[PDB]
């Protein structure tokens, strides 16, 4: 379905709306869902919380009608990065198959971080294949995007390049690879082999060589 | 205490049965709820269908023609069945366990009250691709290194996703780092995990990269050393 | 005439005192101007303003005499940026022809930004002419400063650049040109050209070759 | 309401009469007061002179002995005229309404006030070099482009400034970025102008670059493409 | 002797704790000593200090026992960083010859300060001893670490190179130097040689050629 | 009122009594007490001694059984003798006042106090390397320049440290910037010294760089220019 953003600063308290209003008594289920995990109940009913969720994770009661279903976030952190779903069941309309929408959260204010790049030369092995490969590790880099340029010598190399779109790391900051392909005589016949990954204002070179 | 783990077949064919199974660790299948979710890319999440504790079911009509959960109590599996999948059916399919609530709004002599379901423990996901072309095995590569320094272990070329990978066959764990993978013009994946150690390390503290790759049944090690 | 310049954090109110103190009784008017635009009347009377002026500028009276001429500025912003002018009137001295000095504001803690470098080869229509041109052309950078460096392949040329002394934009960041000119020859013969634009503390460049 | 756009040579020789004139748009001419300013390179914004609604004169002692202020009323046009002119006098000329204020400090009746006069309107100001130098007429190219692209349009060899560049005749107008000029040792201006544009938007939205250099009269047009 | 280190944030009020506690009445000095550079006597009894040095410095009495010895040190700057020695004298113990241990502090959250690189070529009176050296200067950085990178044209060179560790400037600032030794013909022979200083997230070269 | 200055060979032979001086000025020698001090790398401040006015020595246990401490009345210089010096030995050996203070804790007529020294007014320190190999004296090359400019003076291959560099014989003072020195693989240190002055100084304001390195009394000077 559709995705509806929302940005709140860094220690902040994001405040997440649902997707659909209720038209009678309420029973609102509040899921945290980072893509490529499994989501995480935060509230099933309008208010319980279970086990091992913080208190600063609040939805709001059906105390009277016309209370609109938002879940609450205080003291927000980078963690929070994630989509929340907002699972509406009330007395009104039928079953709720459908999740609803997705807010995607996202918290503003958080350090720059420059990348640490990692630049491998082909393996002997996959030299002995016939085939040689440059791999270019950026990680530890925020925020997550950075462009990457390949160089054969000092003139560039465009042709046989692939770059990964950033992922978002463990530790909240981002990883992203890029892999130069080209055949073992284009790495034998050239000096060196550059990758330069630019981030943010600043740009960071690594190179390497056959020596 | 409850624990759930999934298992799929990673790929399957276009106008075929999926089949996938979810085990159940630390509780029993035939007291609670469990649900079907799969989360395309692009798409939100998607329920798929749930079964009751006494064993009943009940599709999502958005899929209702198509899709048969089952159950088996001799242990704790409760299994999937998709047909006709198409290019559109493959995701990551969670398994979790649902709870019934009961909201009452008004008599529940007149039946003023509606059942709500809620998942609390899920699984892990199981990568399912639906897809003409046939797996492959990856093909590793070690990558030597030369404060501290970082050696890696390329796997490239396999299909599909995903890969596991662990250093020292799980021993080593401190600064691992597995990159995601690269989808090539020619179809294929490839991965490269990289690991930082001690310098002095190198002599000679073995480092042995374990690579699976469970859609080609294709396990496979490498060591690197400069 | 001289320029006395001023320093004003940004948000803050500045004083902008006159520069010739009044001898009687005085109508003092004054001039907001950045160069390369057409003035800006602030204050006319001795604290009357036009239309389309906001409050937050404010000149002083003359009730008691002695009190001297001084612009307010409160809350200022990068657009505040510009030479201000004092038309000092009075009773006692004669016809006022000049404007006076000039009152150089510039807005500190504004945000640093980094340039968006763009590099154009020479075109076809330019070489057909035997004659070949390349552009570095640098924008959105604050503050306003960069430096340029052309390269033949990996080996440095200085000789047939030039380079424009920033200038600032609508959106109060700047922008600077670079012209590499050389013989069709020495593009052909050569593998790749790069520009080099370091800005605060880092470098980004932008390789063009021809292809 | 009340609007002024100046007009000049851009260029005038060494020992010859500058002249520009200055329209009025919405208002009337001969009642307001209007000044002629201009703005050199390192110096400040000097005042040259003013004409009242009754159309009398006072020239700046500055350059008294050699400007002359006119006006003429059949339509809202006042022109100057400054001759003898040497490198020192090219600057941007403005065009502005002074508006008389008469500050009362003693008594009316001895003559205890004096008149001040503030420009409250200005015009948009008129580019004038004084030069032994010709005139010549730029030479347009184009550049060509390859989430978004951009493409651009170098106008190099011209004097004197300015030249204005319009994209698409005037309808292109976001994302247009016209960049200050450059004056190389020949003694020759070059510009460069850049608009951003969709990438998808290369096939097929015809880009027109227009470039026009009144000291030349040489107005001429270029499109882009890859 | 082993050095326990302590970080404290810009402008906060720094608490250095004696290395080891008096067993009786006490007469504890403080001296502060910055490696390279003579010790500065903070505080010689138990409280007294002498001319010359800030209010800022301030040290325990001993008015009853139990009363640990702790140098406090308000409002800290840049200038603050170096050892700290705690000399401990008391009635019981002996005499006291060793100075103890060294309380490294370390000021968090000083300005970041880009380095100021400058590269010179290969003297003629050492061109004409057939040997060539390559200087490259690094100034004016914080935080003192930098990294250094020697290309001949673009390839790479590391055979040959000496660098600094960075060291403490007057003006609170790092500095470090890097020589890259070659013959006089792998200086004539190649076209440029270029000196990359990356610093931080950014990274700057200054390169020189045989012209 | 008082400044103490140090004095030493800098380069000391393996087993061989290492001599060191130190001046007084401004005050008296025989009514103070003074210290030495030696500050190894790595290793914190060490104690080496000290002398009463009565001419009364007190060695620390640490280095008791070979060094003597001596004074000279006659002037204000106290010396230092340490044999038998090995490679640990090398260090800066400063020089400094010890205040006697006495501390009182109980009753004086039972002894119920002690004294403590206090080091308030130091030198500045002398560099002393103990070591096999000889002594040699540097060779400075200038590095001619090309807002403003920068030259400098390269003093490479000597041996021990330091080095004292001035521009001008002291008079150039502003922008100078000597650089702490390299440790190469032969063995031998490397400085460099560097001036920013403006530009236009160029013609023709005489850089004159001074170089001492007293461990070898080869003094030199060399002048820059493009």
């Known amino acids: 379905s559709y995705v509806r953003p929302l940005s709140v600063a860094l220690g902040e308290t994001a405040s997440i709306s649902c997707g659909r209003q209720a038209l009678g008594s309420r029973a609102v289920q509040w899921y945290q869902h980072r893509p490529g995990q499994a989501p995480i109940l935060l509230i099933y009913n309008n208010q319980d919380r279970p086990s091992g969720i913080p208190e600063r994770f609040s939805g709001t009661p059906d105390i009277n009608f016309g209370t609109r279903a938002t879940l609450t976030i205080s003291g927000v952190e980078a963690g929070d990065e994630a989509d929340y779903y907002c699972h509406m069941w009330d007395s009104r309309s039928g079953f709720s198959w459908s999740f609803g929408g997705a807010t995607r959260l996202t918290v503003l204010g958080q350090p720059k971080a420059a990348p640490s790049v990692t630049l491998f030369p082909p393996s002997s092995e996959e030299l002995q294949a016939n085939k040689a490969t440059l791999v270019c590790l950026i990680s530890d880099f925020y925020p997550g995007a950075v462009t990457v340029a390949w160089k054969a010598d000092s003139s560039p190399v465009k042709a046989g390049v692939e770059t990964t779109t950033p992922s978002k790391q463990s530790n909240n900051k981002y990883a992203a690879s890029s892999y130069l392909s080209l055949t073992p005589m284009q790495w034998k016949m050239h000096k060196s082999y550059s990758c330069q990954v630019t981030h943010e204002g600043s740009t960071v070179e690594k190179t390497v060589a056959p020596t | 205490q409850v624990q759930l783990q999934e298992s799929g077949p990673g790929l399957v064919k276009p106008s075929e049965t999926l089949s996938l199974t979810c085990?159940?660790?630390?509780?029993?299948?035939?007291?609670?709820?469990?649900?079907?979710i799969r989360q395309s890319p692009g798409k939100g999440l998607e329920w798929?269908?749930?079964?009751?504790?006494?064993?009943?079911?009940?599709?999502?009509p958005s899929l209702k023609s198509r899709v048969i959960i089952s159950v088996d109590t001799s242990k704790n599996q409760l299994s999937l069945k998709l047909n006709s999948v198409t290019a559109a059916d493959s995701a990551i399919?969670?398994?979790?366990?649902?709870?019934?609530?009961?909201?009452?709004?008004?008599?529940?002599?007149?039946?003023?009250?509606?059942?709500?379901?809620?998942?609390?423990?899920?699984?892990?996901g199981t990568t399912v691709t639906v897809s003409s072309a046939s797996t492959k095995g990856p093909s590793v590569f070690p990558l030597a290194p030369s404060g501290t320094a970082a050696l890696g272990c390329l796997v490239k070329d396999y299909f599909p996703e995903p890969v596991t990978v662990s250093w020292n066959s799980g021993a080593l764990t401190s600064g691992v780092h597995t990159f995601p993978a690269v989808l090539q013009s020619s179809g294929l994946y490839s991965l490269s995990s990289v690991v930082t150690v001690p310098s002095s390390s190198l002599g000679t503290q073995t480092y042995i990269c374990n690579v699976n790759h469970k859609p080609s049944n294709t396990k496979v090690d490498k060591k690197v050393e400069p | 005439s001289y320029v006395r310049p001023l320093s004003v954090a940004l948000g803050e109110t500045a004083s902008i005192s006159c520069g010739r103190q009044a001898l009687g009784s005085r109508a003092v008017q004054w001039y907001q101007h950045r160069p390369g635009q057409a003035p800006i009347l602030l204050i006319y009377n001795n604290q009357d303003r036009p239309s389309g002026i906001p409050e937050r500028f404010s000149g002083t009276p003359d009730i008691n005499f002695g009190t001297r001429a001084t612009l307010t500025i409160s809350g200022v912003e990068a657009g505040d940026e510009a030479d201000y002018y004092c038309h000092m009137w009075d009773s006692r001295s004669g016809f006022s022809w000049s404007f006076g000095g000039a009152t150089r504001l510039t807005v500190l803690g504004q945000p640093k930004a980094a340039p968006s470098v763009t590099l154009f080869p020479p075109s076809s229509e330019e070489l057909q002419a035997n004659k070949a041109t390349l552009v570095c052309l640098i924008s959105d950078f604050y503050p306003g400063a960069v430096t340029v460096a052309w390269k033949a392949d990996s080996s440095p040329v200085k000789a047939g650049v030039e380079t424009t002394t920033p200038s600032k934009q609508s959106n109060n960041k700047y922008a600077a040109s670079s012209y590499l000119s050389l013989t069709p020859m020495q593009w052909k013969m050569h593998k790749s050209y790069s520009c080099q634009v370091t800005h605060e503390g880092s470098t980004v460049e932008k390789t063009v070759a021809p292809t | 309401q009340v609007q002024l756009q100046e007009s000049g040579p851009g260029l005038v020789k060494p020992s010859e009469t500058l002249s520009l004139t200055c329209?009025?748009?919405?208002?009337?001419?001969?009642?307001?007061?209007?000044?002629?300013i201009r703005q050199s390179p390192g110096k400040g914004l000097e005042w040259?002179?003013?004409?009242?609604?009754?159309?009398?004169?006072?020239?700046?002692p500055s350059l008294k002995s050699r400007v002359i202020i006119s006006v003429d009323t059949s339509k809202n046009q006042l022109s100057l005229k400054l001759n003898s002119v040497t490198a020192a006098d090219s600057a941007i000329?403005?065009?502005?309404?002074?508006?008389?204020?008469?500050?009362?400090?003693?008594?009316?009746?001895?003559?205890?006030?004096?008149?001040?006069?503030?420009?409250?309107?200005?015009?948009?100001g008129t580019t004038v070099t004084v030069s032994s130098a010709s005139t010549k007429g730029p030479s347009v190219f184009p550049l060509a482009p390859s989430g978004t692209a951009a493409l651009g349009c170098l106008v190099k060899d011209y004097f004197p400034e300015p030249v204005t560049v319009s994209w698409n005749s005037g309808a292109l107008t976001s994302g247009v970025h016209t960049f200050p000029a450059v004056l190389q040792s020949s003694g020759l201006y070059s510009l460069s102008s850049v608009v951003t544009v969709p990438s998808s938007s290369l096939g097929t939205q015809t880009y027109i670059c227009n470039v026009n250099h009144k000291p030349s009269n040489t107005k001429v047009d270029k499109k882009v493409e890859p | 002797s082993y050095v326990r280190p302590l970080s404290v944030a810009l402008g906060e009020t720094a608490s250095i704790s004696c290395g080891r506690q008096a067993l009786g009445s006490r007469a504890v000095q403080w001296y502060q000593h910055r490696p390279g550079q003579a010790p500065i006597l903070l505080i010689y009894n138990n409280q007294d200090r002498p001319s010359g040095i800030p209010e800022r410095f301030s040290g325990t009495p001993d008015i009853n026992f139990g009363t640990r010895a702790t140098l406090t040190i308000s409002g800290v700057e840049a200038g603050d960083e170096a050892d700290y020695y705690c000399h401990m004298w008391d009635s019981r113990s002996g005499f006291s010859w060793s100075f103890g241990g060294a309380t490294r502090l370390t000021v968090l959250g000083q300005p970041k300060a880009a380095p100021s690189v400058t590269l010179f070529p290969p003297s003629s009176e050492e061109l004409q001893a057939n040997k060539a050296t390559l200087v490259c200067l690094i100034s004016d950085f914080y935080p003192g670490a930098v990294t250094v990178a020697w290309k001949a044209d673009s390839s790479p060179v590391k055979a040959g190179v000496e660098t600094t560790t960075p060291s403490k400037q007057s003006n609170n600032k790092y500095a470090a130097s890097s020589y890259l030794s070659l013959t006089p013909m792998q200086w004539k022979m190649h076209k440029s040689y270029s000196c990359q200083v990356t610093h931080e997230g950014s990274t700057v070269e200054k390169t020189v050629a045989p012209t | 009122q008082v400044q103490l200055q140090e004095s030493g060979p800098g380069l000391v032979k393996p087993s061989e009594t290492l001599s060191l001086t130190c001046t007084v000025s401004?005050?008296?020698?025989?009514?103070?007490?003074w210290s030495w001090i030696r500050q190894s790398p790595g290793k914190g401040l060490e104690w080496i001694g000290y002398?009463?006015?009565?001419?009364?020595?007190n060695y620390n246990p640490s280095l008791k059984s070979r060094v003597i401490i001596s004074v000279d009345t006659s002037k204000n210089q106290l010396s230092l003798k340490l044999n038998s010096v090995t490679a640990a030995d090398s260090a800066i050996y400063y020089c400094?006042?010890?205040?006697?203070?006495?501390?009182?804790?109980?009753?004086?007529?039972?002894?119920?106090?002690?004294?403590?020294?206090?080091?308030?007014?130091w030198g500045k320190g002398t560099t002393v390397t103990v070591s096999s190999a000889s002594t040699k004296g540097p060779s400075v090359f200038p590095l001619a320049p090309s807002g403003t400019a920068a030259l400098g003076c390269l003093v490479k291959d000597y041996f021990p440290e330091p080095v004292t560099v001035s521009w001008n014989s002291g008079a150039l003072t502003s922008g100078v910037h000597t650089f702490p020195a390299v440790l190469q693989s032969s063995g031998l240190y490397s400085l460099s010294s560097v001036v920013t002055v403006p530009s236009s100084s160029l013609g023709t304001q005489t850089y004159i760089c001074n170089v001492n390195h007293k461990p070898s009394n080869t003094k030199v000077d060399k002048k820059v220019e493009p």
């Open positions: 002398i009463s006015d009565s001419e009364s020595t």
């Open positions: 400094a006042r010890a205040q006697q203070g006495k501390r009182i804790y109980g009753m004086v007529s039972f002894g119920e106090f002690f004294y403590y020294y206090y080091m308030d007014v």
């Open positions: 401004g005050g008296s020698i025989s009514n103070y007490y």
